[PDB]
Design a protein around this nucleic acid. Structure first.
Ligand code: NA
Ligand code: NA
Length: 327
DNA sequence: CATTAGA
DNA sequence: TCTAATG
């Protein structure tokens, strides 16, 4: 956690590189597992050999470990950090909609900069066009102060269309958090669950609403169960217009809400820990349900959940407020 | 690890 | 269809 830090850190650096710049999933996979193990290792790695003893720890990585242990650096590291082609990839990749594939392709063509980006908007798909379009706004955190206003808003329409709709803004936001990256709205309806063959309009209705009043400005992706968009707080009695924010709303089978809700709310560690627990308590949890465990090794049978509580109860735990769902 | 675009 | 990108 700190005794192994650099090693791991250099390692992930390395790893991450092969993966995006090059296309060496393998090596990329090497660094990672090695990075994973040294990470665990209960003592100060004093040399490559020492390290080497490890699982997934090769001779190549031992080597890098020594140079790094000896000199507070790595050449390949330095060489990479410098590398413009590499540097460029790392960067394009910031635009919502650009990934390693497209990033490398763009370089090869020569778009290494944001401007290049613009000159070449034709060479960009709608997602990417907006990614670039709200680039600034997109990299900006969301003050809870604004979250609250947004929330207030969605909840109002959600309701206005059909009073049946159940909406929850999950995420850190929910967990009390001061700021947030984007707003995640968990959505379900009673007339929709596991079986009842969809109802696409179910999502479509609210999107249309939201857009109706201008909270939604754009559509990244809109499918029958997941809408990826862009919203914005009405820029008041001008002077201060609001940044364009990422927004996601997913339709859900009422029968699997709180599981989902439980989950999306996290934290990533809370979940695990919670998950790790249900297992002892003779269970299994996952993004949609919770099933009793049968000693045959495994077992099915989705228990019925009416709220975050049921789930707790089941695994017989202390209801932990979203606030303390930290770990 | 599942959902959407797109080509 | 497969393959990318997002979460
Ligand atoms: Na990106
Ligand atoms: Na393949």
């Amino acid at each position: 956690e700190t005794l192994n830090g650099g090693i791991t850190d250099m390692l992930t650096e390395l790893a991450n590189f092969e993966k995006n710049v090059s296309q060496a999933i393998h090596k990329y996979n090497a660094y990672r597992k090695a990075a994973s193990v040294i990470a665990k290792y209960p003592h100060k790695i004093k040399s490559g050999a020492e390290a080497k003893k490890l699982p997934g720890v090769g001779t190549k990585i031992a080597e890098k470990i020594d140079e790094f242990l000896a000199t507070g650096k790595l050449r390949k590291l330095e060489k990479i950090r410098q590398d413009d082609t590499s540097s460029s990839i790392n960067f394009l990749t910031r635009v919502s909609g650009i990934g390693p594939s497209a990033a490398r392709k763009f370089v090869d063509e020569g778009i290494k900069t944001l401007e290049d980006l613009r000159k070449n908007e034709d060479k960009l798909n709608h997602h990417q066009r907006i990614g670039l379009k709200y680039f600034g706004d997109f990299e900006k955190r969301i003050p809870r102060e604004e979250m609250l206003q947004m929330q207030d808003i969605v909840l109002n329409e959600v309701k206005k269309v059909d009073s049946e709709y159940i909406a929850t803004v999950c995420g850190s936001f929910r967990r009390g958090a001061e700021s947030s990256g984007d707003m995640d709205v968990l959505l379900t309806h009673p007339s929709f669950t596991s079986e009842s063959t969809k109802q696409p309009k179910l999502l479509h209705q609210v999107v249309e609403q939201l857009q109706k009043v201008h909270f939604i400005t754009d559509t990244l992706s809109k499918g029958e169960t997941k809408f990826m968009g862009v919203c914005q707080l009405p820029s008041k009695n001008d002077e201060k217009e609001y940044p364009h924010r990422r927004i996601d709303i997913r339709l859900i089978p009422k029968d699997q809400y709180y599981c989902g809700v439980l989950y999306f709310t996290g934290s990533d560690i809370f979940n695990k820990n919670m998950r790790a627990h249900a297992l002892e308590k003779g269970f299994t949890i996952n993004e949609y349900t919770i099933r009793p465990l049968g000693v045959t090794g495994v077992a099915g049978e989705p228990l019925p959940v009416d709220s975050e509580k049921d789930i707790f109860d089941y695994i017989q735990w202390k209801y932990r407020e979203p606030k303390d769902r930290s770990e």
